[PDB]
Every structure is written in structure tokens, then in C-alpha cells.
Amino acid sequence: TESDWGKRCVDKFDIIGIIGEGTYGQVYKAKDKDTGELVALKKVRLDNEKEGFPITAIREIKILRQLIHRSVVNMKEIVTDKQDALDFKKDKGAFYLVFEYMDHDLMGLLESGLVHFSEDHIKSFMKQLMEGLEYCHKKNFLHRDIKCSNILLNNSGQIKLADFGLARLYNSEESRPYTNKVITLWYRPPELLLGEERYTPAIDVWSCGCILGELFTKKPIFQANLELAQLELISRLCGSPCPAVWPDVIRLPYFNTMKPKKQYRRRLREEFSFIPSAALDLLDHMLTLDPSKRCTAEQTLQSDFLKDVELSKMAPPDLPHWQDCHE
């Protein structure tokens, strides 16, 4: 049957190329021979067998087994390499997770500095983003890192959230260490920087707020390589963490250890004065330092910006598939 995963072989999926690289495998673009649909294969190698099937892979398997929302990427099935039936003790074959293929990642499109996102485009984008995140948070599944590379969007306009586990970026040979982590920092919430705390839904919402601003500038709002220099950039914009705004900032371990250079006043509305009022009010609420004070996902969906956005009106984004010759 279709519900019985783990028995079909990868021999049913023609491989087109390696779209991404992962810590425990590679990500290949492929076509199912029978269906004709384009899929994405995520390789999980348990051949080291140090501590078994990766827990990160298990997280993506558990969460996305039961999540089918339009705004989240869906796992179709899990296939295996050719396996000898004599014994599975002998077999060390890898397992591949089938996903719906996505055309572009938000990071790629903005890296051009050529694509233009109008207000309506951002509305369509953010509403899908938040609708998916609500569905996940309601199911008590939280995406601990929401990045720009994690946001996958096809040419039509649909937005999907991906990389709950088994991220699709790999660092090899000599390069900046943990480059993927450097990107993750740009969207990390202040609470996590200040302390380990517990994983809260707010950690998702802050990252999505960072994205919101990035869509109005085409540049990440906060870019830094060290946790202290990131906290300072946040403070220059959102204001330094203090009890006056954060009644529980003291409880965090590094509130006194990590300190912004000065105590800054909040300038978010001034440095973003070029953003529409309906949106700016959303940014201000999504970038509140305190997790409890930070707005929830449902509340974002009931914002002026996103409440009255028409889901039917997809309004595709304008992506340049011509004039790449230029001039």
C-alpha cells in the first residue's frame, strides 16, 4: 500500500542531479519514473552507525509525517538502496526521504539583488509563512531555526517551510567554520543568544520577523559573526535588553555576561520609516525582545497586514527569466 514506507527502492526515482548537500548525506533532484513528478531525495547514511539513525533526521521524519499544510513541505515517502533479502544485518544501505521539489530558495532570489518584491507580493508571502507556522505550532511542532535558505518557494508563488531537520548546507575542505550556523545566527532570537532557556514558539516568530524586514530591504537586518556583535546590532535597533522592557531578562544566564555596548533606545520605527504602516506595526510586534510579549503566529495572521490578504489572489512574484543577457 501507499502508507507502508520503507520498502520501495530508490531504483524507482531517476536522479537529475545533486541540488544540495547535507551533514548525513546529499540532496538530489529526481523524477519518479511512474508518476512523472519531480521530487527531492534526502540521503540518510547510517553506515557510520556511531549512534544510529540521526536524531536530526528523525525529527524531520516525525514532524513532517503528519503535517500536510500547503505552506509546509511534505514528505511523500522513504525509499532504500538495493537491499539483500538474505539478512539485513549484512545490509548497510542508506535511506532516502522523498520530498516535493521546490524551484528556488528565498536566499537565492534575494542574492541577485535584481528581483523586486512589491507590498502585495510580501503579503502573499508572509501569510503563507505564518499560516504554516500556526499549523505547526498548534500541532506542538516548532521549527527551531527559520532561515532564508529554509524558505523554499516555487515559480508560481506558493511558499513552503523546510529543513526542520537535516539541513541542506555542508561545509568542506577549508572555509569559514559552521557557515550554515553563521546564517542561523542572523535569525536567532535574543533570548537564545542571551541564554539556552527552553525552546519557545517565539524563537520561530522572531526569525520570521527578521525575514519580514529583509523582504523590504533585500538584505538581512542583523548580520554578525559572533553572538555579542549580533546582540549589539539588535540593540542598536530594538533597544538594549533591560528590565524596563524585559521583566525576566535577569533570569537569562548571560544577561550580565553579555552586554550591549550601551543602553540603546528603540529606533525600529525610525530606521524602517520607509515601510508601510500596516507592515511596520507587524515588524514592531514581531521583534519584541521578551518572548511572552512577542506576538504569536495566529496574532500575526490577524494583523492588518495579513488579515485581509486574499489567499485566492496568488499574484505570482516577478522573477527574471529573460534579459539575463542584460543592458
Partner: protein, 826 residues
């Protein structure tokens, strides 16, 4: 892990901007011409221009204006770079010695802001009280010109109008105010706001707003006697001064967009306008004087003066001579005569300044058998299009072949002693239903000519209604003799067919040498072409013959000869064709992991594919199997302009952000993932868009001259005309020359006090990274021009590795020896 070396062989040749002011000599009017990273200062003479000085700047010159504050004897110079480096400069001439002074400097980049659509704009108050900058949507930055602002500190004023088109400081207003054309959903309007330095905000301007043409493009600041502002659009020119309103809509300017304006008269009665088709117009201001003696602008009149090169900027030398600076053509000094000549033109060309224009494509070919190498480049656009031949026999000899149409590509076919050149000309829908060319050009002046009769796409059954006055591109193939550069033949391609790729080669067991062209059916409705033709031509006995045609489902962006087979890229697919004994193309194998496969290069069985958004892919043709296989892909998202293979392991790529980068293999590292990863070992902001990468050099080597530490030769061309060269180094020589750069930067004084390390840092709008794996050869070659005291200061405490002696030191004379040898590679 890889080490390369980049030098300029020809500096930028394209006029980005031009302003005239009393800079060098407070007495004498000085013309300042700007090219990318390069500033040239001249002095007006009754015969032409006398060059005073040429300086190099770290940064793309974005703003250039000459202003004199109260208390200064001579006009000062303000410049802002594309990376937001600002500075104020002053000429100092201690007799023979010339020195450009950095009076103030700073970086005005904002941590948060949206880059504006119409680009950076810089204007200065007539009272020279402040500098106005429009860097981001919805923000207006102000640098107050106070004596104490040596760091150029600035503040932002919130601007309600987000989408601004152009803004100029008005003349004669009591309080400094800005007149800006802006675009909101209701059209475009002209609005003015007063700027307060004390309050640091906007106050209400004289006229709140007025509804202007939808394509209002330029704002003219009319001088104090007239007052107000002039707005230039596509069909209409208007004058706004409060209650006063003038509208002039001659039917001559509707034919071509006007892109440049200049103040012929200090009083402002005369203004200069230039359109895309090169025509030069004079804006005439008619003055009616009120009875109390005040002056009202009675009418606006536009007169056709003649034809110039497509003018990016225009400036007046006050001798009846206008300097026409062009980025698409050769710049010129023209003379405006009061009396027209026998053809009706008031314009006569004086001098012609060579512009290598946009180098769309170039090929290296030893035409004169010298066993040296000559470079023929596709240069220019529209009527300024041309073919340029360059040789290194100190100056580079450039011969210009006028085409009068845009040249897309070039490839040399020795068997036919001729070049193949793709070109496109502009025709306009005429009353006959067909089209008419605005001027004769190469594809119409051919000795023999042919028009494609292919019926592959005849049954379109698709709607493409023609409106009179619309432009279309007619793409042609041009056969051109290598000695006389005479246009021997022209093949007009099908209607709406664009020629994108060209190759000359034999295929399979076929002894005939063919011209092969890849095309695309371009319809305005399509986001990405979905039809295309691969056409095989044979030039024989003064005639081009169609040997075969292969239909494809997309655009054939790039082709290349691949071991007797034809490798082509159709949209996302990369395909390998075989040439059958029946003289037809047959598909062998395909590869589809691409978004858009714009560029293709090969070496042996290896192929470098340059995807539009996913950088470069190393592919290989596995012969045993007859399939393509992916060796390694760079997973960085850098956009691609052109690509080149350096060696079996190193690959060069040019970003659309003007950043060169090099990717190497992991040399069969144990992990399969590492093998499939292309590490970006080299990063380097070049500052120029590279359309074409080519191998070879123009240096004459009688016979295996060698004697150069540098290994390899890669020549590239840019939009602003630069012809650079990339080559590889050994580890030892890289470290030596890198260590020398760090020493040179401490010693050499930069214009505007711009850090060299910052200037060459890899800069995308999002991520900025230190440059690695590249030696700024232009910095190294400057060691020969610094004074002896600085030479010895550089070589002090020198250290050597892997040398003749593993640890050694070199003197000021020892380094001079190396640099002079490094100057001989170009």
C-alpha cells in the same frame, strides 16, 4: 588554496560622467571626465583640452560635482563611490608637483535601507550649504557642509514619497529646497520640500504638487533669473514655478528618449538635450519681462542641432564646443555653428576619443601571421556598434570597423579567411505593415545577402498584433573579411528570432567547416523562450548556405565544439549532439540539473556550466556510457556573468556584482561529498562587469619566450571597456606579492583615504567578505611609480620562502626587477 593574479591591460574607456568647474586653476575652467575608478582632469583651450592630471580611485565613481563654498578660492570636488565612500578633494600644485588632497572623507552607508531603483543621486545646494544624497527608498540623507564636518557625518530625513525618480536643488529659493519627481500608483507628480539644517526635517515647499507625464525622467534646475524647474519626459517638456506652468510637446522628441541635459547658458536661456538615437537638441527659453522689470518665461522651444554619439553626459566648453561623453560609443568634441552646413546640420565633429564600448564578445586571432595575437572585440551599441582590433606592439593600436548596428557575438573561421559576427538592428513598425530601418547598417550593406526561409515555426496560430511606432530587433549573421573587414554576406534570421550563440568548427567525419548559430523565438508574451533553432551554415564561394536545422524547445544560449560533437545549452537542459553522415544533428545525451545554463566552457571531456543563480557546475562526458556525469557543483548562489576554465582543477567566474571568484576541486578527498563540492578558494571584487572570458595574450613571443613567473593567460572584456588579464601564480610568488601589497597599502596614499582592502573586498549587497586568492596586479605595478624613499620603506624587513635560498631578503632594486617583468605580460 589557489593563487592567481589580475591586471588591467586597457583601462576603462567609457564616460560615466562629466562636470566642468574651476578646480585646478581658479582662473581657468576645468573639465573633469570620469571613468570607473578613474578620474581625468583637463583644462579648456580654444583648440581642445590640455590634460592636467589623471588619478586612480578605489571605488566606482557614482557622484561627481564641483562646488565652491564661501571662503574658498577654487571649486572643490565631491565624489561618492558605489560602496558609499564619500570624500571632498582639492587640487594642490606645488610647481611641477601635483597632489590631490583629501579634505574630508567617510562612509555614509546605512545599516538598514532599501537600494533605490533609479540609483544613487547626488546634488549640492547652490549656496553650498549641504550635500543631498538619495541612497535608499523613503530616506533623504544630508551632509551639512560645515567647516568642522571633516568626517562627513550625516543624518536621514524621513521621506514620504518612496519611489523617487530624480531630485535637484532649486535655484533662487530663500530656503534650500529639493524638487523631486516621484511615482505613486496615481501616476507621477512633481513635489518640492524645504530642507532645514536647524530642525533636521522637511518643511512645506512652495508648490505642493503638480501632475506630470507618466515617464517624467529628468529634473532641470533652472538658474536664479528664470527660477523654477524643468521636467523632461518622453513626449513633453514642462516648466513649473508655482503659479506659472509651461508645456511644450514637439513631435520630434517623441521618436527617441532623451537621457542627458546641460546648461549651455549661465543665465539659462539655452539648454542641451540628447536622445538615444544620438540626435542633439537645443532647449530654448524665451523671456518676457514684466513692466516692473521682472522676467517671466514666455515659451519653451526645441531645435534640432544635429547628430552626436549616444551621450551619457554632455558638457559645454564655452568655446562653442561641447564634449559628448558616451558609454555606448566613441566620445567626441563637437562644434555648434550658428550657420547650418549644406546638409542642414549645425554640428561638426572635431576630435574622436576611442571607446571600447561594451565588449559583448571578443576573440583572439593572429590575423597578420605575426605569431603574436590580435584581439577583435564586439564593441558598441545601436549606431555606435563596431569591431575593434587591438595589438601590443607604449600604446595599444585600435582599429575601429563601423557597423552602425549592435554586435552580439564573434567567432573566427580561418578556412574562410573571415569572421562570423552576430548582430541586431532596430527597425520600427511602419505604415506598410512591415518595418523600416532608422539608418543603413552592416546587415543591409552586405555585398550578398540571404533571408531565412525556415517554416519550422510557420503554423504559429498565435496573436502578435503590430502597433505603428514600436521597435523590433532584426538579428543577422555577418560574414566579414579578415583583411579588409568588408561585409561579405548577411543572413537575416526569422521574424522575432534572436541570435544568441555562434561557433565555427568541423563536426564528426564531415570535412566542411561550418558556421553554427543558436537562436531563440522571442515573443513579448513569453517569460522564457520556448522555441529555438540550431542552424548549420557553410560559407563557400561568397555565399552562405543552410546545411541543416534542428528545432529545440527553448533558447540556445551557448554552444561550443566538444571533441567533434556539438555541445549546446537549451534553457535548463545541457545537450550533446552528434553530426551524422546524413548531415543532421542527433542527440546523444542530456543534463537537466540547471535553472538557466547561460554559459558553457570545455576542456577535454570536462565541461563548466554557468547557471544563472547556482554559480558553476563541473560536468564530464563519460564516454564508456554515453552520458553526462556531475563531478562537482559550487553550492553558493552567486549570479553569473561569464565563466572560464583555468586548468583541470581551477575554474574562474564573474558575478553580476562585479566580483571575480575561483572554485577548485577537493582533489579526490576521501569523502564523496567533498569531491562533489567546489570550494570558493578565490574571491575578488574587480569593479567591472565581465561579458566575455577568453584565453590568450597579445604579447609577442618570438619562440617560447617564457621567462615569466606568471602561468597562463586569460583575457576578459567589460561594459566600460576594460580589458583585463587573469593568470595563476605559485604559492611562493603569491605570498611574496601579497606580503608586498600589505606593505604598499601602508605606504601609498589613496585618493579619498579609501582603504584598499575594503575596495577589493567581495561585496554583494547582502554579504561582504575579505578578498582572497587574488593579487591586485594594478597595485603591484604601482611600485615602479612611487618615490625612492617609499620604495625602500616597502622592501624593509622583507622575507622570502621557497626561493633560491629558502630564507632571504630583497632590496628596492630587487623588487623593481620583478615588477618590470610582471609588466611584460600585457
Amino acid at each position: 588554496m589557489s593563487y592567481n593574479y589580475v591586471v588591467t591591460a586597457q583601462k576603462p574607456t567609457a564616460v560615466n560622467g562629466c562636470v566642468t568647474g574651476h578646480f585646478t586653476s581658479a582662473e581657468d575652467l576645468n573639465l573633469l571626465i570620469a571613468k570607473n575608478t578613474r578620474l581625468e582632469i583637463y583644462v579648456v583651450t580654444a583648440e581642445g583640452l590640455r590634460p592636467v592630471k589623471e588619478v586612480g580611485m578605489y571605488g566606482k565613481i557614482a557622484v561627481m560635482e564641483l562646488f565652491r563654498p564661501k571662503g574658498e578660492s577654487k571649486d572643490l570636488l565631491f565624489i561618492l563611490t558605489a560602496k558609499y565612500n564619500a570624500c571632498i578633494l582639492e587640487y594642490k600644485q606645488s610647481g611641477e608637483s601635483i597632489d590631490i588632497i583629501t579634505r574630508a572623507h567617510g562612509n555614509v552607508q546605512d545599516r538598514i535601507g532599501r537600494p533605490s531603483e533609479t540609483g544613487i543621486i547626488g546634488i549640492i545646494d547652490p549656496e553650498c550649504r549641504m550635500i543631498g544624497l538619495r541612497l535608499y527608498d523613503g530616506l533623504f540623507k544630508v551632509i551639512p557642509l560645515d567647516r568642522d564636518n571633516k568626517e562627513l557625518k550625516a543624518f536621514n530625513i524621513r521621506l514620504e514619497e518612496l519611489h523617487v525618480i530624480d531630485v535637484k536643488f532649486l535655484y533662487g529659493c530663500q530656503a534650500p529646497t529639493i524638487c523631486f519627481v516621484y511615482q505613486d500608483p496615481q501616476g507621477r507628480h512633481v513635489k518640492t520640500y524645504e530642507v532645514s539644517l536647524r530642525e533636521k526635517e522637511f518643511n512645506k515647499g512652495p508648490w505642493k504638487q503638480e501632475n506630470v507625464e507618466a515617464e517624467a525622467s529628468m529634473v532641470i534646475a533652472v538658474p536664479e533669473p528664470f527660477g523654477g524647474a524643468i521636467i523632461i519626459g518622453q513626449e513633453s517638456i514642462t516648466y513649473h514655478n508655482g503659479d506659472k506652468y509651461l508645456a511644450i510637446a514637439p513631435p520630434i522628441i517623441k521618436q527617441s528618449t532623451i537621457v542627458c541635459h546641460n546648461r549651455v547658458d549661465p543665465n539659462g536661456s539655452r539648454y542641451l538635450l540628447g536622445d538615444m538615437e544620438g540626435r542633439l537638441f537645443m532647449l530654448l527659453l524665451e523671456k518676457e519681462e514684466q513692466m516692473d522689470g521682472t522676467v517671466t518665461l514666455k515659451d519653451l522651444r526645441v531645435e534640432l542641432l544635429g547628430e552626436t554619439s549616444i551621450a551619457e553626459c554632455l558638457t559645454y566648453l564655452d568655446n562653442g564646443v561641447v564634449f559628448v561623453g558616451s558609454r555606448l560609443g566613441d566620445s567626441q568634441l563637437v562644434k555648434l555653428n550658428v550657420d547650418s552646413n549644406e546638409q542642414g546640420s549645425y554640428v561638426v565633429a572635431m576630435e574622436t576619443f576611442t571607446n571600447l564600448g561594451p565588449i559583448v564578445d571578443m576573440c583572439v586571432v593572429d590575423l597578420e601571421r605575426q605569431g603574436q595575437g590580435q584581439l577583435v572585440t564586439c564593441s558598441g551599441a545601436f549606431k555606435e556598434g563596431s569591431l575593434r582590433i587591438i595589438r601590443n606592439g607604449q600604446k595599444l593600436h585600435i582599429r575601429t570597423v563601423p557597423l552602425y548596428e549592435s554586435p552580439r557575438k564573434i567567432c573566427y573561421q580561418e578556412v574562410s579567411q573571415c569572421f562570423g559576427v552576430l548582430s541586431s538592428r532596430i527597425e520600427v513598425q511602419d505604415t506598410s505593415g512591415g518595418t523600416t530601418a532608422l539608418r543603413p547598417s552592416a546587415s543591409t550593406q552586405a555585398l550578398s545577402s540571404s533571408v531565412s526561409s525556415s517554416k519550422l515555426f510557420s503554423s504559429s496560430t498565435a496573436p502578435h498584433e503590430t502597433s505603428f511606432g514600436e521597435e523590433v530587433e532584426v538579428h543577422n549573421l555577418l560574414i566579414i573579411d579578415q583583411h579588409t573587414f568588408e561585409v561579405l554576406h548577411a543572413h537575416q534570421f526569422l521574424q522575432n528570432e534572436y541570435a544568441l550563440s555562434l561557433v565555427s568548427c568541423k563536426l564528426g567525419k564531415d570535412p566542411n567547416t561550418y558556421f553554427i548559430v543558436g537562436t531563440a523565438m522571442v515573443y513579448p508574451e513569453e517569460a522564457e523562450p520556448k522555441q529555438g533553432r540550431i542552424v548549420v551554415f557553410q560559407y563557400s564561394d561568397g555565399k552562405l548556405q543552410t546545411v541543416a536545422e534542428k528545432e529545440v524547445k527553448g533558447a540556445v544560449y551557448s554552444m561550443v565544439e566538444f571533441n567533434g560533437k556539438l555541445l549546446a545549452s537549451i534553457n535548463s537542459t545541457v545537450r550533446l549532439y552528434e553530426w551524422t553522415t546524413e548531415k543532421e544533428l542527433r542527440t546523444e545525451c542530456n543534463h537537466y540539473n540547471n535553472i538557466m545554463a547561460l554559459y558553457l566552457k570545455t576542456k577535454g571531456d570536462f565541461i563548466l556550466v554557468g547557471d544563472l543563480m547556482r554559480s558553476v557546475l563541473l560536468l564530464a562526458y563519460k564516454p564508456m556510457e554515453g552520458n553526462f556525469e556531475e563531478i562537482a557543483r559550487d553550492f553558493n548562489p552567486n549570479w553569473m556573468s561569464a565563466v572560464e576554465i583555468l586548468d583541470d582543477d581551477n575554474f574562474l567566474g564573474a558575478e553580476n556584482a562585479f566580483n571575480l571568484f575561483v572554485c577548485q576541486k577537493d582533489s579526490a578527498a576521501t569523502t564523496d561529498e567533498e569531491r562533489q563540492h567546489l570550494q570558493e578558494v578565490g574571491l575578488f571584487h574587480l569593479g567591472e562587469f565581465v561579458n566575455v572570458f577568453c584565453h590568450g595574450s597579445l604579447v609577442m613571443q618570438n619562440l617560447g619566450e617564457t621567462s615569466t613567473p606568471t602561468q597562463g593567460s586569460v583575457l576578459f572584456g567589460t561594459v566600460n571597456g576594460m580589458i583585463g588579464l587573469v593568470t595563476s601564480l605559485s604559492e611562493s610568488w603569491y605570498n611574496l606579492l601579497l606580503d608586498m601589497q600589505n606593505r604598499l597599502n601602508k605606504v601609498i596614499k589613496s585618493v579619498g583615504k579609501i582603504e584598499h582592502s575594503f575596495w577589493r573586498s567581495f561585496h554583494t549587497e547582502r554579504k561582504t567578505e575579505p578578498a582572497t586568492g587574488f593579487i591586485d596586479g594594478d597595485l603591484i605595478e604601482s611600485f615602479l611609480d612611487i618615490s625612492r624613499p617609499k620604495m625602500q620603506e616597502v622592501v624593509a624587513n622583507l622575507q622570502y620562502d621557497d626561493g633560491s635560498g629558502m630564507k632571504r631578503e630583497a632590496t628596492a632594486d630587487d623588487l623593481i626587477k620583478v615588477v618590470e617583468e610582471l609588466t611584460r605580460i600585457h
